[PDB]
Design a binder for this molecule. Structure first.
Ligand SMILES: [Mg+2]
Length: 448
């Protein structure tokens, strides 16, 4: 076996069982051998163990002759931005994003904030770490503290025309993660009225884990929107690389529809651009991109795949239905801040509420949302679905799992690689009844 903390795209584990200061220091040593020359940017989130793990990581890096730029408490996207902006050799964010309190982890990037994944260095780091029995060296390099967020803040504001913004009333819910610090730095430069919920960074998480998909967190944001007559509400996960929207009725907006909306917002500024999207839910995105005069580019889901595809296509924007939004101008990386600035600008300029913008698309392309099935045998469950629908002769595509297009409805079925878990997404052309029947039909086939 191997170190469980090392997953396909990042490091994640329970503290101190699977991730601790010694592993963090050894990761620092091993990372120094994988990067090109240059300093390494380090940041961390609000979790209690995060400063300790980042300092151990810094010690291991500086023991191997790497200068470290410590940007302190931050969101994950700030590590991406500063790594690119400072022309660093790489960057590490210490975070467990949205996971329980006993968890922590790291996201690693190399130059230009390109991801380090299991086949692009991460497992080379793992094997090095797993074989390193040597005694800790002494730091032979400097740590510079650079907590100024000015360039990051200026970059965020460049995406919108501030003279066109209306004074919207916005609920913001940092979930006691790091997002509220950025909101407060942006607030002097914007006309919005903010209603701050769960605002202060607090790694004890007195209001629950910063995971806006949990129904108790959803309800706190929705209630704040309705109680304050806000134009819309925004919630983030702990390291705020994901943002989630609530319209003025308090309705939680399914992330699929935001891809098409952000695409049309962006394409109004960069006409004719390419937009990368994933294959789970597609029809609404394709139509909104083409109507705005852009070119949709299908890609495998997963941030590593999206980012590489955006680079090879010079795509201006890429989005996933699971609340990941990537921007060419932002070093081809994801941000949980750019999306809501663009949406506030779209609401301001159009005179349409977020509800009306979303409602129109939901009626045209109703979707099931992503549905998970633990099964005994993934291959057998998939075969049972395929053979059942064979006589309708769907158009099949295998970009990411199996996509079957029947004309008036389609589905995508992906299998997890670790565990026997199937993920289902269904959508139709304007037919909510068909959506429900086919979704329950497939659900039965997947189960008993
Ligand atoms: Mg996150």
């Amino acid at each position: 076996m191997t170190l469980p903390a090392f997953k396909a795209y990042d490091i994640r584990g329970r503290v101190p069982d699977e991730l601790n200061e010694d592993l963090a220091r050894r990761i620092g040593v091993a990372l120094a051998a994988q990067l090109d020359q240059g300093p390494v940017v380090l940041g961390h989130d609000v979790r209690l163990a995060s400063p300790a793990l980042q300092e151990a990581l810094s010690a291991g890096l500086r023991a191997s002759g790497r200068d470290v730029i410590d940007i302190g408490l931050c969101g994950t996207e700030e590590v991406y931005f500063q790594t690119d902006y400072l022309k660093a050799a790489g960057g590490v964010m210490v975070t467990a994003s949205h996971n329980p309190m006993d968890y922590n982890g790291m996201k690693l990037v190399r130059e230009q904030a390109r991801p380090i994944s299991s086949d692009t260095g991460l497992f080379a780091i793992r094997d090095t770490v797993a074989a390193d029995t040597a005694a800790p060296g002494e730091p032979t390099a400097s740590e510079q503290s650079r907590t100024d967020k000015t360039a990051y803040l200026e970059h965020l504001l460049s995406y919108v025309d501030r003279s066109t913004l209306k004074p919207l009333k916005l609920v913001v819910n940092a979930g006691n993660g790091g997002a509220g610090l950025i909101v407060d730095l942006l607030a002097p430069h914007l006309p919005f009225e903010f209603v701050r919920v769960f605002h202060e960074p607090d790694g004890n998480f007195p209001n629950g884990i910063p995971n806006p998909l949990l129904p108790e967190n959803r309800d706190a944001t929705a209630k704040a929107v309705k109680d304050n007559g806000a134009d819309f509400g925004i919630a983030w996960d702990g390291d705020f690389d994901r943002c989630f929207f609530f319209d003025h009725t308090g309705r939680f907006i399914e992330g699929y529809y935001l891809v098409g909306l952000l695409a049309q917002a962006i394409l109004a500024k960069q006409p004719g651009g390419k937009v990368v999207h994933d294959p789970r839910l597609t029809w609404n995105t394709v139509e909104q991109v083409e109507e705005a005069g852009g070119i949709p580019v299908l890609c495998k889901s997963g941030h590593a795949f999206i980012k590489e595809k955006m680079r090879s296509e010079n795509a201006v924007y890429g989005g996933e239905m699971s609340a990941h939004h990537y921007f060419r101008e932002f070093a081809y990386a994801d941000s949980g801040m750019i999306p809501w600035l663009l949406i506030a600008e779209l609401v301001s300029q159009s005179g349409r509420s977020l509800a009306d913008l979303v409602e129109a698309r939901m009626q045209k392309f109703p979707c099931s949302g992503e549905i998970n099935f633990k099964v005994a045998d993934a291959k057998a469950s998939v075969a049972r679905v395929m053979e059942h629908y064979a006589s309708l002769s769907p158009e099949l595509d295998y970009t990411d799992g199996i996509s079957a297009d029947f004309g008036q409805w389609r589905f995508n079925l992906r299998s997890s690689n670790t565990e026997p878990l199937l993920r289902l997404n269904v959508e139709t052309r304007g037919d909510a009844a068909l959506l429900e029947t086919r979704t329950q039909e497939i659900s039965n086939l997947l189960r008993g």
